Amino acid sequence: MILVFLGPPGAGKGTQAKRLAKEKGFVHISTGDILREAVQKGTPLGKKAKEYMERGELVPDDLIIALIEEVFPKHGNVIFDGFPRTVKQAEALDEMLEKKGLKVDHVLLFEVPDEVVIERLSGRRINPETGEVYHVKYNPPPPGVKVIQREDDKPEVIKKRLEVYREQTAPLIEYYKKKGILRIIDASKPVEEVYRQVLEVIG
Ligand SMILES: Nc1ncnc2c1ncn2[C@@H]1O[C@H](COP(=O)(O)OP(=O)(O)OP(=O)(O)OP(=O)(O)OP(=O)(O)OC[C@H]2O[C@@H](n3cnc4c(N)ncnc43)[C@H](O)[C@@H]2O)[C@@H](O)[C@H]1O
Ligand SMILES: [Zn+2]
Ligand SMILES: [Zn+2]
Ligand SMILES: [Zn+2]
Ligand SMILES: [Zn+2]
C-alpha cells in the first residue's frame, strides 16, 4: 500500500506516520527528516539543501526527485510524508510507481488553521538523542528527558514555511482531487482522534 500525507507544517503528519510505522509496519519516508540528517552530517546532499531549509523555502524539485528515487523503499507499505510538495514532484512519484505497476492508494490531507500551525511548531521539542517528537503542552517530554527546539521552528521560519505551503499545495490538492484519491482529515483534533480518522480512511 502507498500513502501520501499532505498538510501544513505542524499538522502532525510525522506523528501519525510514526504511529502507523510502529503499529502496522509501514515504512515512513519523511523528506524533511532525511534532509535534516544530511544537513547535520554535512554530506554533499546536506550542503545543497541547507540554504533552503534554513529560510523555510522548498528544496528544488530536481534534488528532491532524485532523493526520492534513492530512498524509495524496495519492500513494504510506504508513507510519503511532506513529499510531494509540488505538482512536478507528484508527477515524478506517479511515474516512478507506474513503472513498478504500483500507484498511490490514498492521499490524506491533514487540515489545520494557521493559528494551530504556529502553536504546534513553536511548542515542538525533539529529544536530540533519538529524534522523538514532543510538544511542550500537548505531549511534553517526561521528567528527566532533555529536549531541544529545531532552529527552523523559530517564528520567522515557521511563517515562511507556512506561506510556501499555502501557495504550493493548492495545485497539488487539485491534482489529487482529479484522481479521486484525496481524503481530508481534521488534523486540529487531539492525536488520538486524528489517528482514528487516518485508520478509517485507509481501512
Ligand atoms: N518534498 C519536499 N520538497 C521541497 N522541500 C522539502 C520537501 N520535503 C522537505 N522539504 C524541506 O525541508 C523542510 C522541512 O520539511 P518537513 O520536515 O516536511 O516540514 P513540514 O511538513 O512543513 O512540517 P513538520 O515536519 O514540521 O510537521 P508535521 O506535519 O510532521 O508535524 P509533527 O508530527 O512534527 O507535529 C508538530 C508538533 O505538533 C505536535 N502534534 C502533532 N499532532 C498533534 C495533535 N493532533 N494535537 C496536538 N499536538 C500535535 C507534535 O508533538 C509536534 O510538536 C521544508 O521546509 C523544505 O525546506
Ligand atoms: Zn514532519
Ligand atoms: Zn511510464
Ligand atoms: Zn510566497
Ligand atoms: Zn485503501
Resolution (Å) of this entry: 1.9
The technique by which this structure was obtained is: X-ray
Q: In which residue are the cell numbers 532533555 written?
A: 146
**Residues present in the chain in total:** 203
Cβ(97)–Cβ(2) below 8 Å: yes
Q: Which domains does the chain have, with CATH numbers?
A: 1-203 (3.40.50.300)
Cβ(182)–Cβ(176) below 8 Å: yes
Task: Tell me, in angstroms, the distance from the centre of ligand 4 to residue 57's CA.
Answer: 9
Cα dihedral angle (114, 48, 78, 202), rounded to 10 degrees?
10
Backbone torsions φ then ψ of 182, nearest 5 degrees: -80, 135
55 CA closest ligand 1 atom index: 57
Cβ(83)–Cβ(7) below 8 Å: no
DSSP 3-state assignment of 111?
Answer: strand
- Catalytic residue, candidates 18, 19, 36, 85: 85
Span between the terminal Cα atoms of the chain, in Å: 11
Identify the nearest ligand to the CA of 104 by its number: 5
Q: What is the DSSP letter of 37?
A: H
Backbone torsions φ then ψ of 12, nearest 5 degrees: 105, 20
Q: Catalytic site residue 13? A: yes
Task: Tell me, in angstroms, the distance from the centre of ligand 4 to residue 52's CA.
Answer: 14
